[PDB]
């Protein structure tokens, strides 16, 4: 067959022989220098674990040195290692999202913490806010005892952090708030006691590279989005069932799903992988998880049409209004929610024709989840036409902005990378037919060579968390590729 079909089969194969016997693909997180600096600041100040700390020092000097992140965490690895403003600028430069004033208290307040600058001269208030409230409320800990006025602090403040006290692995596999939660409350008397058993489990978490990673994996949106990827091949392999088994097993009560194993908050991202991939391998067989997963992406619905990510009244975000449209368009009962989220979609498209950035750092993330909606759920008449005109203007900004070598990289002037690209072919796939040397020919060549001879894929990563910080699952790079060149042939 074509040259991309035999990429396909290669990587293909790749996937299948990744899922192990229990369902899952494996999905470990890199180790990341915002986390790695704080578990070194929090172990150097309880002058504890001193081969850790010498391992994580190693390898802040070492990234630092050859793989730089963006200048926020390298003002936080200076400042532990040992100006402020300009890497917070530049970190959260032109960073277009309903976040940035929050994450702009946040992330002064971490550098703050670590005594790279002072901290923001705001009413305490500006603190308050399940999404980031413990991370939130232990940085104005942090802040009522960095500025001298620890009577600040109350009983409820204090409370919010009693998860991090707890043994093994972070509460929702979050290093970075079990890190942020144990800096606040080495401060309080009455919490040390339970602190020298958690430093144990924090130190004994580093990876082989002497790093702290931001999250223990991905585990359920990888496999999700690899089931989904493996069921839209010709003929889908036989694992997909026990994926679907090994996700479904792991619903939440609420019918949701969150993004590893042990994660109880759901998210609708990791929710309508799920949903899309049981639909297509397990519609009978995991009817009842079905089911209850339209019932938790019904309940967060927003007012407006839109779907937030992860509670009703947070904002709508167009990503995850697209997402969900699809995931529920497959019953005819919800037409009513989808045509209004397809709606919702249509009226937040730029003037350029792209969407947003959210958890992914490319534009080509949400043109795909928007795309796929614009063109999939059913529709006739005029919407059909105001939602081919939408489509139409998104297709036309990866053309406009493709690149020589025929991918896309994080923006317009970026390198290409493939998964970046992977999600360009994704929305490309449902414009007009592949043509030598069009938008959509070019970009399958260049994933075509881009392929390793493992059959894999390594990209630089897209997934943002806390927005906008890069991190890093290397597993999602042949998967998001694999769901490209499933999607396109």
Known sequence: ??????????????????????????????????????????????????????????????????????????????????????????????????????????????????????????????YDTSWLHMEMKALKVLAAHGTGHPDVVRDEDWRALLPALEPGPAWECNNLAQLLALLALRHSPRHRPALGDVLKHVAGRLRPDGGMPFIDGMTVFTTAAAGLALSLLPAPPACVTPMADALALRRNPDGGYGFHSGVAQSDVDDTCYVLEFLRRAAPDRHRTAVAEAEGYLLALRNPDGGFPTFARGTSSEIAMTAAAASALAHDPDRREEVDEAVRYVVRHQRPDGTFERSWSRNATNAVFRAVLALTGVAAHGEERRSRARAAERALAHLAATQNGDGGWGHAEAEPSDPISTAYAVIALARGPRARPGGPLDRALAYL??????????????????????????????????????????
């Open 448 to 489: 075509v060579e881009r392929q390793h001879p493992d059959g894999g894929y390594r990209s630089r990563p897209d997934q943002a968390g806390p927005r906008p910080l890069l991190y890093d699952v290397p597993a999602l790079a042949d998967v998001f590729v694999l769901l490209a060149l499933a999607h396109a042939t």
């Open 1 to 126: 067959a074509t040259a991309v079909v035999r990429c396909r089969t290669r990587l293909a194969r790749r996937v299948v022989a990744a899922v192990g016997p229990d369902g899952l693909l494996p999905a470990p997180c890199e180790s990341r220098v915002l986390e790695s600096a704080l578990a070194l600041a929090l172990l150097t100040e309880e002058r504890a674990e001193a081969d850790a700390t010498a391992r994580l020092t190693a390898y802040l000097r070492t990234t630092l040195r050859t793989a730089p992140p963006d200048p926020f965490q390298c003002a936080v690895a200076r400042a532990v290692l040992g100006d402020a403003g300009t890497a917070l600028d530049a970190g959260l430069d032109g960073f277009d999202h309903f976040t940035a004033g929050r994450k702009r208290l946040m992330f002064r307040t971490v550098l703050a913490a670590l005594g790279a600058t002072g901290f923001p001269a705001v009413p305490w208030e500006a």
